[PDB]
Design a protein around this motif. Sequence first.
Motif, PDB file in Angstrom:
ATOM      1  N   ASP A   1     -11.735 -29.126 -22.960  1.00  0.00           N
ATOM      2  CA  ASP A   1     -11.563 -28.672 -21.603  1.00  0.00           C
ATOM      3  C   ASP A   1     -10.476 -29.383 -20.811  1.00  0.00           C
ATOM      4  O   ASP A   1      -9.617 -28.737 -20.221  1.00  0.00           O
TER       5      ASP A   1
ATOM      6  N   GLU B   1     -18.483 -26.890 -13.328  1.00  0.00           N
ATOM      7  CA  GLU B   1     -19.761 -27.549 -13.530  1.00  0.00           C
ATOM      8  C   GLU B   1     -20.844 -26.618 -14.079  1.00  0.00           C
ATOM      9  O   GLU B   1     -21.584 -26.939 -15.007  1.00  0.00           O
ATOM     10  N   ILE B   2     -20.924 -25.405 -13.513  1.00  0.00           N
ATOM     11  CA  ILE B   2     -21.833 -24.351 -13.916  1.00  0.00           C
ATOM     12  C   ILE B   2     -21.537 -23.712 -15.284  1.00  0.00           C
ATOM     13  O   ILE B   2     -22.460 -23.337 -16.011  1.00  0.00           O
ATOM     14  N   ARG B   3     -20.256 -23.515 -15.669  1.00  0.00           N
ATOM     15  CA  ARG B   3     -19.881 -22.922 -16.948  1.00  0.00           C
ATOM     16  C   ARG B   3     -18.515 -23.413 -17.379  1.00  0.00           C
ATOM     17  O   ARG B   3     -17.523 -23.201 -16.676  1.00  0.00           O
ATOM     18  N   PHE B   4     -18.403 -23.993 -18.580  1.00  0.00           N
ATOM     19  CA  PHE B   4     -17.183 -24.580 -19.085  1.00  0.00           C
ATOM     20  C   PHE B   4     -16.407 -23.611 -19.964  1.00  0.00           C
ATOM     21  O   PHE B   4     -16.965 -22.913 -20.818  1.00  0.00           O
TER      22      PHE B   4
ATOM     23  N   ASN C   1     -24.477 -22.667  -7.666  1.00  0.00           N
ATOM     24  CA  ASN C   1     -25.336 -23.691  -8.193  1.00  0.00           C
ATOM     25  C   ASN C   1     -26.704 -23.079  -8.542  1.00  0.00           C
ATOM     26  O   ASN C   1     -27.510 -22.720  -7.689  1.00  0.00           O
TER      27      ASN C   1
ATOM     28  N   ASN D   1      -8.662 -26.987 -18.365  1.00  0.00           N
ATOM     29  CA  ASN D   1      -9.738 -26.729 -17.414  1.00  0.00           C
ATOM     30  C   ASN D   1      -9.289 -26.883 -15.961  1.00  0.00           C
ATOM     31  O   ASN D   1      -9.677 -26.121 -15.073  1.00  0.00           O
ATOM     32  N   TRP D   2      -8.395 -27.826 -15.657  1.00  0.00           N
ATOM     33  CA  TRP D   2      -7.843 -27.996 -14.326  1.00  0.00           C
ATOM     34  C   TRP D   2      -6.814 -26.918 -13.954  1.00  0.00           C
ATOM     35  O   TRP D   2      -6.427 -26.781 -12.799  1.00  0.00           O
TER      36      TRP D   2
ATOM     37  N   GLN E   1     -19.263 -24.468  -1.364  1.00  0.00           N
ATOM     38  CA  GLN E   1     -20.602 -24.638  -1.923  1.00  0.00           C
ATOM     39  C   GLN E   1     -21.299 -23.324  -2.277  1.00  0.00           C
ATOM     40  O   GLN E   1     -22.027 -23.228  -3.259  1.00  0.00           O
TER      41      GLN E   1
ATOM     42  N   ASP F   1     -14.037 -27.245  -8.569  1.00  0.00           N
ATOM     43  CA  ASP F   1     -15.167 -28.042  -9.002  1.00  0.00           C
ATOM     44  C   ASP F   1     -16.301 -27.112  -9.472  1.00  0.00           C
ATOM     45  O   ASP F   1     -17.223 -27.519 -10.172  1.00  0.00           O
ATOM     46  N   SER F   2     -16.197 -25.786  -9.205  1.00  0.00           N
ATOM     47  CA  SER F   2     -17.084 -24.768  -9.775  1.00  0.00           C
ATOM     48  C   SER F   2     -17.248 -24.711 -11.326  1.00  0.00           C
ATOM     49  O   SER F   2     -18.319 -24.250 -11.738  1.00  0.00           O
TER      50      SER F   2
END
Length: 354
Positions: free
Chosen positions: A224, A215-218, A306, A228-229, A289, A212-213
Amino acid sequence: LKWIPRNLPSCLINVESSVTSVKLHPNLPIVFVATDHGKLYAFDLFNYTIPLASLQSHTKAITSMDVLFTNYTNSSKKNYLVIVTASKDLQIHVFKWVSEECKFQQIRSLLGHEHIVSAVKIWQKNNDVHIASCSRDQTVKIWDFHNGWSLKTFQPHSQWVRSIDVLGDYIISGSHDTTLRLTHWPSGNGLSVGTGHEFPIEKVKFIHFIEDSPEIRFRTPSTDRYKNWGMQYCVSASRDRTIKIWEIPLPTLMAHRAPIPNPTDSNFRCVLTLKGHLSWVRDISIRGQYLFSCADDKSVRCWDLNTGQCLHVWEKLHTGFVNCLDLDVDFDSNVTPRQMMVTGGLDCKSNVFM
């Protein structure tokens, strides 16, 4: 289940001399420390001051320890029964752990590196069938656990291999030629060479239940959901004083089989560069996290990836360099009991943080 990473140390364990690795047991409330002594010590971390057991049989200095980490619940239960260690006597000793929380015997001594062995790891995916190690040799070696035989020798870097972290099928190496490599264990081919650290890499960790990291950079910048997964990730810690995040399918290193194959053989794909504290980064851990890390700046640091911020600093942790930390893996019924980190320094101490 959120967590607390802080306080003032609620146990300080006296050790003989320089702490090299600190490592938690999978099942029992006990933790193990390696040092330049050359020795392994065992402590209960729940209670203090506890002199549970000492292990001797290395000649010069113990630099890494493993067998505690596991890749599964059933593997955990069977795996915590061995211990593997690394040394400057060019040995990989294999120990037997007993139900009474100690090691009563060395089972094997494995010989084959020609200089300092500075990391060692058990292959948890294979139920402790193989050991990986790395050395000043410039070499990574794979050993049969139950015969002691050296079975694969990778020849990769032009300088000292400092670390080896294994994820079942794949091998993460880190070294003095400023490079991180990911090698395929069955073939011996390298998928990746992660180039852009400025100074020696001391450390690696892989990312876990937290893909789920993204989120910060694609990565790639486009379409994706196709791949992406399928992204596999690792972190490098360096004498740069900087910590990097790499996703590995896109900083695959080419050997040029055509010419340039897209961003392959370009700049590295590196996701984040965490710029922080004041000396060589010795360690690096994924909570989920947060990311945790330690360094020659006498400090253990909690990083919030984050927003890239370093959300907390525990700088008075040791009065000399901090060599290693270990976090305790969350699991049902053991949630709150797994509230610890352990940390070891050049001030000859192993410290328990709640």
